[PDB]
From a paper:
The retroviral structural protein Gag forms the immature protein shell of nascent virus particles. All retroviral Gag proteins contain three canonical domains: matrix (MA), capsid (CA), consisting of independently folded N-terminal (CA-NTD) and C-terminal (CA-CTD) domains, and nucleocapsid (NC). During immature virus particle formation, these domains function in membrane binding, viral lattice self-assembly and viral genomic RNA (vgRNA) packaging, respectively. Our results show that HTLV-1 uses a distinct CA-NTD arrangement to form the immature Gag lattice and that, in contrast to other retroviral structures, the CA-NTD is the key determinant of immature HTLV-1 assembly.
To analyze the structure of immature HTLV-1 lattice interfaces in more detail, we engineered an HTLV-1 Gag truncation construct for bacterial expression, purification, in vitro assembly and analysis by cryo-ET. The MA126CANC tubes exhibited varying helical parameters. Tubes were sorted into nine groups and each group was processed separately by subtomogram averaging. The two groups with the largest number of tubes had similar geometry and, thus, they were pooled and processed together. The resulting final reconstruction of the CA-NTD layer had an overall estimated resolution of 3.4 Å. The helical pitch and densities for large side chains were clearly visible at this resolution, which enabled us to build a refined model of the immature CA-NTD lattice interactions. The in vitro assembled tubes had the same arrangement of the CA-NTD layer as the full-length HTLV-1 Gag VLPs (Cα root-mean-square deviation (r.m.s.d.) = 1.2 Å), underscoring the biological relevance of our in vitro system. Specifically, CA-NTD residues M17 and Y61 have been identified as essential for immature HTLV-1 Gag lattice assembly and particle formation. In our model, these residues are located in helices 1 and 3, respectively, which form the hexamerization interface together with helix 2. To further characterize this interface, we substituted residue L43, which interacts with M17 and Y61 in our model.
Numbering used by the authors:
A (entry chain C), B (entry chain A), C (entry chain B): 13 to 125
The structure:
């Protein structure tokens, strides 16, 4: 049951004033993601929806660095021989992957300033 | 039948102006808690959405003290050999613990100002 | 079809300007009660939601007076061998008791001033 249009518009409107990485932005986005459990595809939809392309690029760089760090350290069930981290997360049989991807996404978003 | 994004958005918006623990906030939060019948996990999510980390920490300490006294006295449904009240309240077959957790939560949050 | 968050939040939204006993307050309360046909549980929830604790206490004094008067006089389907009207209105198969309780509720609210 991925978010429809109205859910995403409520999400966008509530955070009009707050700048990326602010506590309010992070709070609301954390609620949304932890309520809907969206795969990487849908998180990309949301990120391209809310902020500009510059913020998306910054987030992508930060998320790539975080993926490298937390994948060399180790992940509970990351089998990197069966596809990249993004693809495994989007599989609906890899709940752990979805959870870790969501946490990495949120950390990268919070790590702008 | 857990709450959805719209319910949380309405709960936060209706009480944006008021202060934590004000009679208005207490009315709305008590109604939500008594209506949706949530466990500890959902209550933690709601608190993270509503108030900042400072208010979250203060409520955490106050609720720790309240749960401390309550379950140190001894409660009808609490069996300390299975886990902390935060975990028993998350099992849907322990509604007594869930209601006690809800009431300790609301009282603790009301005791802030 | 017991009311959710949205219904009660509306009710309080349009019962915010007026004061208890005023024509608007009673209009809205009577409409809601006549529509959802709520028992004593939901009625007490609605009252705790709407007004301060002082007004709720006053209303309950008036309601106890009305209920005592009616039980002395006699109710069509009230059988005191099982429990008070207070508890007889929670059973879904006692529509008469529930509607009588709703009417005493509305009267006691209308007679506050």
């Amino acid at each position: 049951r991925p978010w429809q249009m109205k859910d995403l518009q409520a999400i966008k409107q509530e955070v009009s004033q707050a700048a990326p990485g602010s506590p309010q932005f992070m709070q609301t986005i954390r609620l949304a993601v932890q309520q809907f459990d969206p795969t990487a595809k849908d998180l990309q939809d949301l990120l391209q929806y809310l902020c500009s392309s510059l913020v998306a690029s910054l987030h992508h760089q930060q998320l790539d660095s975080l993926i490298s760090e937390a994948e060399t350290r180790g992940i509970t069930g990351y089998n990197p021989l069966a596809g990249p981290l993004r693809v495994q997360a989007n599989n609906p049989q890899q709940q752990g992957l979805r959870r870790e991807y969501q946490q990495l996404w949120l950390a990268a978003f919070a790590a702008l300033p």
